[PDB]
Amino acid sequence: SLQFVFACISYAVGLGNVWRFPYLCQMYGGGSFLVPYIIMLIVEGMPLLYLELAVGQRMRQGSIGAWRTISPYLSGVGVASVVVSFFLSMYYNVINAWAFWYLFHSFQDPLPWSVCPLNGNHTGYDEECEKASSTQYFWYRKTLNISPSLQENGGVQWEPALCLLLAWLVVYLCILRGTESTGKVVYFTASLPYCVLIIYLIRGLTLHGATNGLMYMFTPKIEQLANPKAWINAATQIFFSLGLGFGSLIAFASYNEPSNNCQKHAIIVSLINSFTSIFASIVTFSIYGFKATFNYENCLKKVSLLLTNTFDLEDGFLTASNLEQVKGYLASAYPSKYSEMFPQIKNCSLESELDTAVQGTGLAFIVYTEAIKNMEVSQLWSVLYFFMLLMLGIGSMLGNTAAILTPLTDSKIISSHLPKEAISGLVCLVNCAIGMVFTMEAGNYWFDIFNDYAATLSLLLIVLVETIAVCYVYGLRRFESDLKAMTGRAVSWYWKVMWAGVSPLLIVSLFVFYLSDYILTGTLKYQAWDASQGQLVTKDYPAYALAVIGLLVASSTMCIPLAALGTFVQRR
Amino acid sequence: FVGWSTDWSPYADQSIKVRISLKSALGDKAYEWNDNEMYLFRSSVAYAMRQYFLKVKNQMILFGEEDVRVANLKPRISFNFFVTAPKNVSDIIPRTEVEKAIRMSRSRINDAFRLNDNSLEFLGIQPTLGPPNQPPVSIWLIVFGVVMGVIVVGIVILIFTGIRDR
Numbered sequence: 001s002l003q004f005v006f007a008c009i010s011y012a013v014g015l016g017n018v019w020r021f022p023y024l025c026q027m028y029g030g031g032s033f034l035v036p037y038i039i040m041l042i043v044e045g046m047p048l049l050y051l052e053l054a055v056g057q058r059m060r061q062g063s064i065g066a067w068r069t070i071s072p073y074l075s076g077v078g079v080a081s082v083v084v085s086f087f088l089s090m091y092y093n094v095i096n097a098w099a100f101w102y103l104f105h106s107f108q109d110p111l112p113w114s115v116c117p118l119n120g121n122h123t124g125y126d127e128e129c130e131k132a133s134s135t136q137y138f139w140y141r142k143t144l145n146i147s148p149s150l151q152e153n154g155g156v157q158w159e160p161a162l163c164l165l166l167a168w169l170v171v172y173l174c175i176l177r178g179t180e181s182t183g184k185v186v187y188f189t190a191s192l193p194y195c196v197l198i199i200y201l202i203r204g205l206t207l208h209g210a211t212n213g214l215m216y217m218f219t220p221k222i223e224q225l226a227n228p229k230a231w232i233n234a235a236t237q238i239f240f241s242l243g244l245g246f247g248s249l250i251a252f253a254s255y256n257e258p259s260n261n262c263q264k265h266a267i268i269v270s271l272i273n274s275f276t277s278i279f280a281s282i283v284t285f286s287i288y289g290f291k292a293t294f295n296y297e298n299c300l301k302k303v304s305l306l307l308t309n310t311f312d313l314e315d316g317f318l319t320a321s322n323l324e325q326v327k328g329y330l331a332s333a334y335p336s337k338y339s340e341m342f343p344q345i346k347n348c349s350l351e352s353e354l355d356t357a358v359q360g361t362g363l364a365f366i367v368y369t370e371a372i373k374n375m376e377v378s379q380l381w382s383v384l385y386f387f388m389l390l391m392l393g394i395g396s397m398l399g400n401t402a403a404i405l406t407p408l409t410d411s412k413i414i415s416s417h418l419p420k421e422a423i424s425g426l427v428c429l430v431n432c433a434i435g436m437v438f439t440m441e442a443g444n445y446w447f448d449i450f451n452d453y454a455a456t457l458s459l460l461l462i463v464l465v466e467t468i469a470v471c472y473v474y475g476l477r478r479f480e481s482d483l484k485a486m487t488g489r490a491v492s493w494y495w496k497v498m499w500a501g502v503s504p505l506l507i508v509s510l511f512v513f514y515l516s517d518y519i520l521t522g523t524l525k526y527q528a529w530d531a532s533q534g535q536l537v538t539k540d541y542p543a544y545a546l547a548v549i550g551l552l553v554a555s556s557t558m559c560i561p562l563a564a565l566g567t568f569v570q571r572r
Numbered sequence: 573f574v575g576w577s578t579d580w581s582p583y584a585d586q587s588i589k590v591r592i593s594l595k596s597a598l599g600d601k602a603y604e605w606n607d608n609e610m611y612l613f614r615s616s617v618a619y620a621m622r623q624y625f626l627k628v629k630n631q632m633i634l635f636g637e638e639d640v641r642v643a644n645l646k647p648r649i650s651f652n653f654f655v656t657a658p659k660n661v662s663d664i665i666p667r668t669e670v671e672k673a674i675r676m677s678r679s680r681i682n683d684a685f686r687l688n689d690n691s692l693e694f695l696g697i698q699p700t701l702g703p704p705n706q707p708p709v710s711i712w713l714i715v716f717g718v719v720m721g722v723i724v725v726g727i728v729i730l731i732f733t734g735i736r737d738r
């Protein structure tokens with residue numbers, strides 16, 4: 001019936017493809033990132049997803065159990081499947097906290113991101129809130145209070161810490177309460193995000209100059225298309241959105257009937273996830289194009305006002321459509337006055353704005369707040385959208401935490417020492433203690449680091465190990481025979497070829513390209529807020545941050561080889 | 573210094589510069605700025621001066637439209653005006669008093685031409701937007717406290733029921 005479709009939609013639609021995907025798309029030029037994602041979908045999404053589902057269905061065990069049954073000296077990879085997930089639980093719930101924050105400041109008629117604060121004379125506006133948008137100022141100063149550089153970090157901000165604690169308490173409450181009622185919750189928690197996105201798409205399409213963002217997002221600029229970073233980010237983003245590497249898919253497939261259809265399920269899940277990501281990107285980039293058009297018009301209006309004031313022209317004489325001609329006439333009339341203010345004139349174009357209108361890890365928040373502030377009843381739409389985002393994040397965190405706790409629940413030794421319910425509380429407390437780091441003044445930089453590298457290489461390596469083990473260790477023919485015995489209609493040659501020599505080769509090639517690019521450039525930099533310019537400036541990563549990122553990647557990557565060496569020693 | 577400059581004028585020290593942007597504030601349906609509009613503006617300035625001299629210094633000075641002298645008129649509608657004594661040309665009201673008078677009654681001048689503090693700039697008189705009123709303590713804190721309380725109550729009751737069942 002429709003219950004299965006709703007469950008598939010709920011498993012496919014999450015906070016990931018709604019939040020992380022638009023930011024990655026904006027960072028890597030839009031279309032130049034959109035094209036690989038579709039390419040990385042039909043090559044890596046469906047085949048690997050179907051492989052994981054088939055393994056979970058055939059093995060009838062958990063991730064650790066399945067990867068131990070496949071091979072002893074490989075069982076440690078299952079442990080890695082938890083560790084990476086743990087790192088996700090380290091930071092992902094922090095996003096929910098931000099949602100809570102943006103929810104809590106949604107019951108005021110003077111919305112905090114709607115009107116800039118006064119400078120102090122009650123005559124103008126703050127310099128930071130004037131150079132930057134009101135939403136940007138509220139996000140970077142009144143919400144994150146971000147430091148200009150990563151080197152200087154302040155104390156733990158109390159309000160974000162309280163928001164994070166509330167988010168963890170909500171997660172723990174949902175863990176304790178919700179165990180099998182989700183079938184009813186699927187009737188409501190699967191269609192609301194689509195309705196919210198439809199409403200926001202309508203609002204964006206009703207805004208002036210919104211088609212520019214849609215054109216930008218669909219424009220495949222070949223100059224930035226050759227960047228291996230875009231391919232790597234698309235691959236890790238689709239792997240994260242589909243849940244590959246986390247092992248939750250295997251656990252879910254182990255709970256289904258042996259005769260349950262898997263190819264149709266995997267294809268439907270992948271296609272729904274891709275379509276939802278594309279739709280969210282469409283809406284977000286429509287609002288982003290609206291912002292870029294507004295900034296371009298504001299810059300042109302400021303330039304025209306400055307020229308009119310300093311050359312005493314008529315109010316309506318100078319317009320955007322005839323700017324350069326009037327500039328040439330002024331230069332030809334008296335070049336002395338024109339040159340007296342030539343450096344003050346600023347050249348602003350739609351391309352530059354669309355490149356650097358809004359960027360960073362909080363692109364979705366800023367963009368949707370801008371969309372909200374131009375509504376009719378801003379509070380209602382703000383509350384609805386933030387509640388939808390919070391629900392999606394809660395569902396994603398519930399899935400991640402269940403995947404983490406399942407191997408711990410299966411641990412007989414741990415179960416016999418402590419109550420099963422107290423394990424969830426201990427895990428939540430530890431995760432909150434670890435994630436309190438993100439609540440500092442410079443916690444946004446660490447959040448960006450853990451969103452860029454704590455799941456980039458780890459997921460790729462885990463998927464590569466899994467597909468190598470399936471294709472060559474266990475034997476492709478044996479797996480195909482087992483699947484045919486279980487359900488019939490053996491895998492077509494397309495799936496066999498993809499599992500044998502397409503996906504692993506592409507993953508290895510992408511990893512080699514990324515490593516070569518990193519070695520050649522050697523200039524891994526991060527964006528940092530600049531209140532003086534009211535923008536984002538690239539700054540080189542410090543030694544300690546690079547070491548921390550390297551350690552975070554290395555632990556997840558070496559979780560499997562260390563256990564393999566231990567198993568080899570035990571056998572020997 | 574041998575020579576002279578063609579910019580200095582004896583009335584430049586006490587002159588207040590007005591810049592008017594009718595097209596930006598009104599878009600369409602914008603009236604033309606002929607001499608009648610200048611007469612109306614001078615009358616409004618004289619009225620503001622009368623109001624300041626009556627309600628602050630308690631002096632009845634009969635200003636007129638001919639006591640607001642205007643110079644350097646431009647197509648931008650940008651000029652310099654200064655107010656003299658009612659019948660003493662050699663007496664020019666100091667710029668501080670004129671600025672205080674304009675600040676006192678800028679709303680009437682703004683409404684006379686349907687302009688709002690951005691299309692009628694006096695270049696030295698900076699308007700005040702107004703202090704932003706704040707909630708009693710915090711709406712967000714109250715909502716957060718209520719949500720945290722209900723969540724804690726739910727957690728406690730669920731834990732108690734689970735313990736009692738087993």
Ligand SMILES: *[C@@H]1O[C@H](CO)[C@@H](O[C@@H]2O[C@H](CO)[C@@H](O[C@@H]3O[C@H](CO)[C@@H](O)[C@H](O)[C@@H]3O)[C@H](O)[C@H]2NC(C)=O)[C@H](O)[C@H]1NC(C)=O
Pocket residue numbers: 660662663664
């Ligand atoms: C028109 O306004 C001007 C001011 O701009 C008036 O000039 C002022 O006239 C008074 C009366 O004579 C002057 O006071 C006297 O100054 C002399 C200077 O040596 C002093 O010796 C006297 O004891 C007395 O204090 C005042 O200085 C003068 N101010 C200026 C700036 O010239 C003028 O009287 C007004 N005309 C009329 C008809 O009211």
Ligand SMILES: *[C@@H]1O[C@H](CO)[C@@H](O)[C@H](O)[C@H]1NC(C)=O
Pocket residue numbers: 119121124
């Ligand atoms: C606000 O008042 C102070 C008073 O010292 C002044 O320095 C500052 O320039 C004023 N702000 C603006 C925007 O003029």
Ligand SMILES: *[C@@H]1O[C@H](CO)[C@@H](O)[C@H](O)[C@H]1NC(C)=O
Pocket residue numbers: 342343344345346347
């Ligand atoms: C704008 O273009 C002119 C044309 O050469 C250039 O000289 C100037 O540096 C550019 N930037 C600004 C801010 O004027």
Ligand SMILES: *[C@H]1O[C@H](CO)[C@@H](O)[C@H](O)[C@H]1NC(C)=O
Pocket residue numbers: 122699700701702703
């Ligand atoms: C701004 O403040 C000044 C004095 O502080 C006051 O006269 C003026 O009316 C205010 N403007 C408003 C409240 O719009």
